[PDB]
Amino acid sequence: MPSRRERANAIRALSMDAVQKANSGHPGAPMGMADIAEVLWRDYMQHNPSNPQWANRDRFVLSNGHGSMLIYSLLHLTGYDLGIEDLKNFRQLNSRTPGHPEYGYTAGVETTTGPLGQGIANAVGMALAEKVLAAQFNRDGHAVVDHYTYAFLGDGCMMEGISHEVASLAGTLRLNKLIAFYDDNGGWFTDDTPKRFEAYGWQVIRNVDGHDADEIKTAIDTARKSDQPTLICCKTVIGFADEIAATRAALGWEHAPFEIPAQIYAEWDAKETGAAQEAEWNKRFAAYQAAHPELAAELLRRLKGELPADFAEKAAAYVADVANKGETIASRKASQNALNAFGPLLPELLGGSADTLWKGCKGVSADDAAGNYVFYGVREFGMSAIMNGVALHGGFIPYGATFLIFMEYARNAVRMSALMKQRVLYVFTHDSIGLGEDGPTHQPIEQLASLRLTPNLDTWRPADAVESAVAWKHAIERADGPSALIFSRQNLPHQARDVAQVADIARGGYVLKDCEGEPELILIATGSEVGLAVQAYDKLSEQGRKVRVVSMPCTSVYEQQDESYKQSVLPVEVGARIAIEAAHADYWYKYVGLDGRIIGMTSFGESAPAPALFEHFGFTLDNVLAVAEELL
Amino acid sequence: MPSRRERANAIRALSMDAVQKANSGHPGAPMGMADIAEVLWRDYMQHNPSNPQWANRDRFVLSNGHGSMLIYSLLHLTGYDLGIEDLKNFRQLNSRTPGHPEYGYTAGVETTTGPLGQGIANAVGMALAEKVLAAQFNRDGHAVVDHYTYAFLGDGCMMEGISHEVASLAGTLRLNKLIAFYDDNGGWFTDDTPKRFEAYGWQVIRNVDGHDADEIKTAIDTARKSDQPTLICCKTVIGFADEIAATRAALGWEHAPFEIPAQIYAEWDAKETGAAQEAEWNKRFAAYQAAHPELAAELLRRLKGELPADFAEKAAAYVADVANKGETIASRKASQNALNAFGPLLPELLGGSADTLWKGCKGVSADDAAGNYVFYGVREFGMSAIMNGVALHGGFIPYGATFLIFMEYARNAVRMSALMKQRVLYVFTHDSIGLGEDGPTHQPIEQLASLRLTPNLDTWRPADAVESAVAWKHAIERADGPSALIFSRQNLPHQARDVAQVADIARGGYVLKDCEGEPELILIATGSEVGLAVQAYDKLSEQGRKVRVVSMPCTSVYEQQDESYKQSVLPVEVGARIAIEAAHADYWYKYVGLDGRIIGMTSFGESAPAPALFEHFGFTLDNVLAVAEELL
Numbered sequence A, B: 001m002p003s004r005r006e007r008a009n010a011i012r013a014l015s016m017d018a019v020q021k022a023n024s025g026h027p028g029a030p031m032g033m034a035d036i037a038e039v040l041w042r043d044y045m046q047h048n049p050s051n052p053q054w055a056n057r058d059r060f061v062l063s064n065g066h067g068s069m070l071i072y073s074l075l076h077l078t079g080y081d082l083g084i085e086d087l088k089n090f091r092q093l094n095s096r097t098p099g100h101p102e103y104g105y106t107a108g109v110e111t112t113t114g115p116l117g118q119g120i121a122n123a124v125g126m127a128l129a130e131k132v133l134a135a136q137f138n139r140d141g142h143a144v145v146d147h148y149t150y151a152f153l154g155d156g157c158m159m160e161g162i163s164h165e166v167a168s169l170a171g172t173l174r175l176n177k178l179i180a181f182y183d184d185n186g187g188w189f190t191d192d193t194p195k196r197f198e199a200y201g202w203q204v205i206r207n208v209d210g211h212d213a214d215e216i217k218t219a220i221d222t223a224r225k226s227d228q229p230t231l232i233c234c235k236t237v238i239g240f241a242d243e244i245a246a247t248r249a250a251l252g253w254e255h256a257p258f259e260i261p262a263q264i265y266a267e268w269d270a271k272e273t274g275a276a277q278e279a280e281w282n283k284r285f286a287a288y289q290a291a292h293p294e295l296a297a298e299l300l301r302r303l304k305g306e307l308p309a310d311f312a313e314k315a316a317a318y319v320a321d322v323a324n325k326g327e328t329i330a331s332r333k334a335s336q337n338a339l340n341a342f343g344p345l346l347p348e349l350l351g352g353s354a355d356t357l358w359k360g361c362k363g364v365s366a367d368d369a370a371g372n373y374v375f376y377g378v379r380e381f382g383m384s385a386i387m388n389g390v391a392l393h394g395g396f397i398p399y400g401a402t403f404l405i406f407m408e409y410a411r412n413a414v415r416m417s418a419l420m421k422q423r424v425l426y427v428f429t430h431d432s433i434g435l436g437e438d439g440p441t442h443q444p445i446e447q448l449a450s451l452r453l454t455p456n457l458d459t460w461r462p463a464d465a466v467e468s469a470v471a472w473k474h475a476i477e478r479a480d481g482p483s484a485l486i487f488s489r490q491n492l493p494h495q496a497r498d499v500a501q502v503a504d505i506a507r508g509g510y511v512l513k514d515c516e517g518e519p520e521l522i523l524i525a526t527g528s529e530v531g532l533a534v535q536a537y538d539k540l541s542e543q544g545r546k547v548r549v550v551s552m553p554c555t556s557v558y559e560q561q562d563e564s565y566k567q568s569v570l571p572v573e574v575g576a577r578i579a580i581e582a583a584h585a586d587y588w589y590k591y592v593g594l595d596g597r598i599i600g601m602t603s604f605g606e607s608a609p610a611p612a613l614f615e616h617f618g619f620t621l622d623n624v625l626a627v628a629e630e631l632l
């Protein structure tokens, strides 16, 4: 009869043998945390290896990303579709077992980790999703949404700033079904971490012997009854060819690499209990569907990530309405306008801002999570990684707003949205020197380019309300990647368009103003600079010059268009091209090459009123004409 | 006889009148914190308005960046070169009073703030600089370096992750002369902030009435005796045309906008005490210079930011030695090699890593700060903003290392280094898919481009040890901006060069391999991809093709070169150009336009051994030849 320790040692054996064979990786977390995992996964975790997408499974997040063999071991041992051959391919090209866990490519991996601090943030988001979805959907006698979020984290995560942001907020929102296990395994890190977490309003369980199954169980039982999120502080000491063989022998583990005894597999396998757990929940879901069929249909739709059947038609009708009202407003107001039309169609939208609001917004709070808007406070990074967790969890389409400059605080989370191919919607306001007096520390220059070079991210910089509506629609309908929607503080004039041009906004780049025959000059512009481009077009046309304005609200989408469409907008034979954008010039060589010109920014901004800054930096009619004159 | 409150109200009056006239900005911090400032600045602060560069002045940092009128009011009132006319130009183009304080442009502003959390981090760096410089230079009977670092911060700073990183480290290093005043002025922020700071090993003074001068003084006296950094938690409630007039009248402030009574100016003026304070310290410095002239000379040199007279000659000799040893090593090893040669020449270097080390490194600790290397722990953002504070303080040249991917965690601090034009040296390792198995979450793609589009930042990606030595030398000698030095994990072959080519490395971009007459093809490469470019050059030359290799270790420097030098490296008439770099392709349109080609990355990476990833992503001899064939 295998002991708990023998079963935990299977995780230790597989981890160290996998690392050894790959000659790469680190068996830290699995060595230290295996006994904790054996209790947690065998005695508490509700999950079905046959269906890792069961909507009411418990969520487990390994924030110590480097501990990847811990999760691969657990998934293999408990019966997921991850075999011994996968473990022997750890860290090899296109294996199912990459060096850090990657959501999508591996059955049972709930998020992509590696960058420290973000795992715990993702877990915070998942626990938030569960709490909100439960408050939205649960009814008397039908607790259909009801599961825990368990996370493992280490010293690295605790040192990172993002831990402070997301633990603080988790405390304020009372995410009592978030239960985190800190691997306190042991010059630069002396925090009293338990006291710090009490300051956030968490319950803390101190000094848990991480190699004692009775202590671990007692802590977990306490945490599962908590009214607050709980941090279980686990003291561990196990861990680190000769060193491996020594430790392996000390553990009393005699078996050859990758061989696990049949009774150990039997005691780890979760297919039997897992089947029964999901079947029991399916029975409760059917009861819910009978008693509340409208809700239940909405829940399923939302869990699938499907939009309402008529959203596309209503949204295109809305885009057309806007194109007819023809207002001149800040793209920031057009965004709030789009949310006002789209919000009431999309009960799955979960908005917020790093403290955006439309008429039906209702803030979530600890006492009442049935809302649809989160006040994240001054926590840009934490907001972003939380939104990743919300998106992974299912049930919502999250969006989150801050100033474009503070994208930089959240930069790696934005990158992770893209890497994981999640539909997370970033709203970045105050997009340029147009913000005026706040000055160079707040004025973006290089940030648009940073977003545009992020793979799988779409960045929309709408020239007016019509393009703002198209951008939101497109972002919402994009299920397989994130979008960043960039808005001005200042007013943007409505642009005239025919039906076909409004349609072509969705192609990322299109002809807004044209000449009869091949243009002598092409003005490419985005966002708040399209209006200036149109002025230059007006003026230059009066001189008999054959000019075209191309509005480029989304470069990544434009690039995805077919060769013949691209030739129709930016013909390869017209080298006389001028890009106009209040952002870093260097990006635009992609579109004007070495034969064209760029009217952009090549320095930091200044603290002055916007009109004075635009004058100062050359975003004037006169300067554009001069550049054209020089170029032609 | 003006009361304390009347004197504090001068700050309130000027702040609100300045904001009103500009119709922009927020008088929050000055309204709330004016009584605290009146105690702190009149009764405690050691400073000389006639010389804001006095080396032993106390340092004051306003982390609530939006509170800019607080500092402009203090500087004006106490007699700095900032007049009433400057205050009336708050937030106007090229005024001395920009919307957020900017170091360099305004007498007495110690750092540029605005992005929340970074002010306090900068203050942490300044207190670290003082503590290290004192331990390095002070001797029995000559406490020549001896001053406090006072900082104001608010809720926004406290919510930001960076506060956790820098307060944690400040606690560990016992920066007991750092004294911070928290404006606790009052849904999303419920931390028990005092308890959190105790967990970092700070002293906390709770519940200080921020409008009671006796309570404020008592707290400051306690803090000034503390063995730990101290957080003074100040409860404030004062603050927010009609509303302004109401508050102004309530305060009993009858005077017209911008008029301050003569006795209030008299009681605020610090020119008399300031003169005496600096004169007293100058007398002690002379005594130190008599007793320890070598040290004292070194201190002055270092405070001036001057390098040793013979550093340039020794460093060029070193570059030449490396060019002769001709080794093939990871650029990461060449960096450590350069530090081994340069380190012992530069006692001002203050290194570190977000836990790099050369033979004479000695770690700083709480008990012994006489070292030259800081273990920042897993705190990339905090490290970077701290280094800014170290650079501003004087006495050091800081450098700090992390993985290139985690530049993203510290992104805005890097931008702030550049904005402030400070010599801070960023060392970014593991620069590409060449890092291998750790996989896409760690593998940079877009980060080089992000650095390259940062104004006033130089980014060096050295192809071998010779270029690594040139890059370090150039970075060290660059006093008016920061540098980012980018290193590979994998081995880089030595490139053959004549004397003139080694010299031209310092020009940012140069001809490494050439053809007789005008080239038919130009291969532009950087860093670890230059070796592949040379292979392609060898192969293609054998075919009779006229090829050139341009090595481009620093684009920003290359761009600063004269037109005729640029024409000599990248002739405008040779359109057949191929850029080769294991990073995002889109950057390179700047150098190859629409007629050339790019062999780079356009996706995230993968988890595999490096050779397999280079094969997979097309960094092979065969692929390069194919692209040339297609292009020609």
Ligand SMILES: [Ca+2]
Binding pocket: A206, A207, A208, A209, A215
């Ligand atoms: Ca215990």
Ligand SMILES: [Ca+2]
Binding pocket: A309, A310, A311, A312, A313
């Ligand atoms: Ca439909």
Ligand SMILES: [Ca+2]
Binding pocket: B206, B207, B208, B209, B215
């Ligand atoms: Ca009190």
Ligand SMILES: [Ca+2]
Binding pocket: B309, B310, B311, B312, B313
């Ligand atoms: Ca010399």
